[PDB]
Each structure stands twice: as C-alpha cells, then as structure tokens.
C-alpha cells in the first residue's frame, strides 16, 4: 500500500497549512498524524482520522475521505514548524502500520535574530595532549544559514576548519558550531585568532589571545 | 503508563543486538506491540509486528528473515533480536502500543553500526561565557548536564572519523555516554 505526501510545505504565519496524504480508498482506513520536531521524538497530534488527543490545540484538525487524508493546521505558529507523518492502521495487510514519506512544514516570515558568537581557545589540558582546537559557537540566529570565516591574525585559514550544519532549538532558532584544528606550535606563534561568523551579509567580531 | 526502550548502542556491521522495551501502567498482554525505526533525518518505518498476548508476527522486508521479535507477558517487556546489522539499520528504534486507546510511544534508543572502534568522549574545559568540549567519542549520543555547587547544547561534528560536541551556559561539567560518563570543572 502506497502513501504519498508532499515532501515540503511552507506557509506564512497565521495562515493555514494543509498536509495531504493519499492512498487508494484511504478513507476506508484509519489514519493517524504524528508531528516530530527536530531532535524530539514523534508526537501523536491526530489519531483515528478526526480525533485529537489531550493537550493538542484545537487548531490541529484532521479529515479522511476518498483517496486523501488531510491534516489542517489553522493559524500556523512557528512552534508548529516540524515534520508531519501520516500513518495508516489496517489489521488485514501483512504491513499493519504503513507510514508516509512525511512533510516538513516550514514557517516562513519568521523574525530574524542576530547570531550570538562565543570564541573559545584551546584548553591548558588540551595543549598538554599535543592538540589545539578552536571552538566557535553560534546561538539564537535565524535564518539558519551562516558562513564561518576562520582567520588567523591578518591572514585567512583554510585547513582545520570544520563547521556543523545548524540544528533548530527550542525557540525555533538555530545553533551551529565550527571547530578549527591546529597545532600547538602555530598557537603560540601567532598573537591572535579570530572567528568571523558571516550571517546575512553581516559578519560579527570574535577574537582570542594566546597570551592568556 | 509508560514505555521504556533500551539496549541500543554501537555494533559492528553484520553483527547482532538485542533491543528491550519495558512496559508499565497497563495490561501488557492484551495489546499488540510494534517496533518502529527511523533513519536519521529520514522518514519513519515500521519494523516488526507482534500481536497481542498471542503469537502473530509480521516483518518489514528490510529485516525479514533477519530481525526476530519476541515478548514476555509476565515481565511486561518487549524484545527485538537484530541480525546481520547493516547501515540501513542505523536508526532510532521506537516501541509502540498498538491498541484500542491512543497509541503509546516510548522514547526510542539509537542503534548505530560503525566501521570505527567504539570510544569514550574526552572532556576539555573552555574559558574566555564558559563551556565544555566533548570530542573523540562514538557513537553520537552526547548529553550535557550543568550541575554545579555553590542550558542547551550544540550539535556534533565529524572530525578525523570521530565526533565532537560542545556547549555553554548563561552569564562543573558532566556528560553521559554509554562508553563512559565524564566530568570536568571550569573556573
């Protein structure tokens, strides 16, 4: 049995989102609807077509008829931006449960937030291990598309740069880190290292001092 | 009324691992259990159907003839034997109450097959506003707890075959990992 979901659906805040999930006469079956925010476990928000559980806001509504079951989120909030999966229950097929490909609901038009950058030098316990790792931490920024420019004193660097892709946090704002691996010889050779987090055509300062 | 998945970790490819699911708050026997997995970032996937206190089994084709499901009605626990582990089986495995009432989902446990040897996180302090570096661990199951005597973490990155994560607090560090629980204090 085949379930089809649109891969991506995006709306404006306050507008309604309608997540379609189709199947040959899916109305004659029972459909559930799981909402999974990134990092959390899947949450049941609609079960048995139309019913919604406890603690689910009334704006989450469901419908199942003909060849398409639909999860209609009215008055969409940024807190609703998540992946949504329809699940069909049929105690007659050799695949009792059958999930859909899922739909990641993105809430456009969210307010931007300036990145909070925190540059960290290698540890005194790390230089004794012949290691040297710079850590550049970025928090509470939207959208989640930053470009970390690692520069050493006046010169720019290329090797050792390893940046993570931003992961959404509780306040729907993204966070990402960027590590610069170097040698203890180059740490006490230069006099200052800097992490230039370039976000939305707007860098942000951060500098450390190998002295202390 | 809760479900507790456990037994996941790091296994070598082609190996075997046993997953458990402790039940509580209901008559475990009268309701059908399911195993549901989910590749990282990908979609959901049903794995195995075990039926009620009886014995009726249904399998996902990916693990058909490989994984084996079982349950203990007296001890109120569900089991899922996994065989010939592959990278297609590296996922978050969930144990769910298929029944009359709203389905119960326990917090899933991660199973990760890996080509590198399992290793414990190494903690280094970070000062300038203060932080905690946890690097050279495997698999990525890091978690920070900032308990001091007198709050959210960052995602991990891959460096040289192992992962590394960090964090920081507002204005002693302790992390939990199956290979080893580490601690470090900062000034």
Say how many domains are in chain B.
2
3-state SS class at B53: coil
Question: How far is the C-alpha of A148 from the C-alpha of A16, rounded, in Å?
Answer: 36
Q: What gap in Å lies between CA A118 and CA A34, rounded to an integer?
A: 36
Residue B98 CA to residue B106 CA, distance in Å, equals 12
Considering only the beta carbons, identify the residue of A137, A163, A181 that sits closest to B166: A137
Given 1.10.1040.10, 1.10.760.10, 2.130.10.10, 2.60.40.10, which CATH number is that of A116-208?
2.60.40.10
Which of B156, B166, B182, B185 is the mutation pick for testing A, counting most A CBs within 10 A?
A: B166
Residues B160 and A139: their CA atoms lie apart, in Å, by 25
Say yes or no: do domains A8-107 and A116-208 share a fold.
yes
Secondary structure element (H or E) that encloses residue B50, with its range = strand B44-50
Task: Quote the CA–CA distance of A22 and A31 in Å, as a whole number.
Answer: 10
CA distance A196 to A113: 17
Q: How remote is the C-alpha of B56 from its chain's centroid?
A: 26
> Cβ separation of A179 and B164 shorter than 8 Å?
yes
- In the block, tokens 């998540």 appear at A82
Distance CA A21, CA A71 (A): 8
- Degrees, nearest 5: CA angle A115-A79-B131: 40
DSSP 8-class letter at B13? T
| B126 and B94, same domain (yes or no) | no
Chain A's closest residue to B164, CA to CA, is: A179
Look up the domain containing B135 and give its range.
122-184
Mutate to test the interface with B, among A4, A96, A166, A180 (most CBs of B within 10 A): A96
Of A41, A96, A175, the CB nearest to B154: A175
| Resolution limit, Å | 3.4
The torsion region of residue B100 among left (phi > 0), alpha (psi -120 to 50) and beta comes to alpha
Does the A8-107 domain belong in CATH 2.60.40.10? yes
SS3 state at A31: strand
Which of A62-72 are b and which e, b meaning 16 or more Cβ less than 10 Å from the residue's Cβ? bebeeebbbbe
Q: Give the integer Cα–Cα distance in Å for B176 and B156.
A: 15
Q: After which residues is chain B broken (C to N over 2.5 A)?
A: 128, 150, 171
A2: tokens are: 């085949």
Structure solved via:
X-ray
Residue with tokens 């001890």: B75
- Residues comprising chain A, all counted: 212
Residue B87 sits in the same domain as residue B150: no
Q: Which of A6, A42, A193, A207 to mutate to test the interface with B (most CBs of B within 10 A)?
A: A42
Paired strand residues for A8: A104
What DSSP letter does each residue of A98-140 carry, written as one string?
A: EE---EEEEE-SPPPB--EEEEEPPPHHHHTTT--EEEEEEEE
Minimum Cα–Cα distance from A125: chain B residue: B124
Calculate how close chain B gets to A104, using CA atoms only, in Å. Answer: 10
Chain centroid to CA A32: how far?
Answer: 23
Cβ–Cβ below 8 Å for B155 and A126: no
Closest CA to A59 of A14, A3, A120, A101: A14
How far apart CA A19 and CA A144 sit, in angstroms, is 24
- Are B44 and A176 an interchain contact pair (Cβ–Cβ within 8 Å)? no
The residue among A136, A146, A138 whose CA lies nearest residue A199 is A146
**Chain A, chain B: beta-carbon pairs less than 8 Å apart:** 106
Choose among A174, A208, A204, A168: nearest CA to A191: A208
Tell me which residues of chain A, numbers 51 to 90, contact chain B at a CB-CB cutoff of 8 Å.
53, 85, 87, 89
Q: Are residues B141 and B55 in the same domain?
A: no
* DSSP E strands, A37-82: 43-46, 60-65, 68-73
A90 chain-B contacts, CB cut-off 8 A:
none
């Amino acid at each position: 049995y085949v379930l089809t979901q649109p891969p991506s659906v995006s709306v404006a805040p306050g507008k309604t989102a309608r997540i379609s999930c189709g199947g040959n006469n899916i109305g004659s079956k029972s459909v559930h609807w799981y909402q999974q925010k990134p990092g959390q476990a899947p949450v049941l928000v609609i079960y048995y077509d139309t019913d919604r559980p406890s603690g689910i806001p009334e704006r989450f509504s469901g419908s199942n008829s003909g060849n398409t079951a639909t999860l209609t989120i009215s008055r969409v909030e940024a807190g609703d931006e998540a992946g949504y999966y329809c699940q069909v229950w049929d105690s007659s097929s050799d695949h009792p449960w059958v999930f859909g490909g899922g739909t990641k609901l993105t809430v456009l038009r969210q307010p931007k937030a300036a990145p909070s950058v925190t540059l960290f030098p290698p540890s005194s316990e790390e230089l004794q291990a012949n290691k040297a790792t710079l850590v550049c931490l970025i928090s509470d920024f939207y959208p989640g598309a930053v470009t970390v420019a690692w520069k050493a004193d006046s010169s720019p660097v290329k090797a050792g740069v390893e940046t993570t892709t931003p992961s959404k946090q509780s306040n729907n704002k993204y966070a990402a880190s960027s590590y610069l691996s170097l040698t203890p010889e180059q740490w006490k050779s230069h006099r200052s290292y800097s992490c230039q987090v370039t976000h939305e055509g707007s860098t942000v300062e951060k500098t450390v001092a190998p002295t202390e | 009324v809760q479900l507790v998945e456990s037994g996941g970790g790091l296994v070598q490819p082609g190996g075997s691992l046993r997953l458990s699911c402790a039940a509580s708050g209901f008559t475990f026997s009268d309701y059908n259990m399911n195993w549901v997995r989910q590749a990282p970032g990908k979609g959901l996937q049903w794995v195995s159907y075990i039926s009620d206190s009886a014995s009726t089994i249904y399998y996902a084709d990916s693990v058909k003839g490989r994984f084996t499901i079982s349950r203990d009605n007296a001890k109120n626990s569900l089991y899922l034997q996994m065989n010939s582990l592959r990278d297609e089986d590296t996922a978050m495995y969930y144990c769910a109450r298929d029944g009359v009432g709203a389905p119960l989902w326990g917090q899933g446990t991660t199973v990760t097959v890996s080509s590198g040897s399992a290793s414990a996180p190494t903690l280094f302090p970070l000062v300038s506003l203060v932080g905690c570096l946890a690097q050279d661990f495997l698999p990525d199951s890091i978690t920070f707890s900032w308990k001091y005597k007198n709050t959210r973490g960052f995602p991990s990155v891959l460096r040289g075959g192992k992962y590394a994560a960090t964090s920081q607090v507002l204005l002693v560090c302790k992390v939990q990992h199956p290979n080893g629980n580490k601690e470090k204090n900062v000034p």
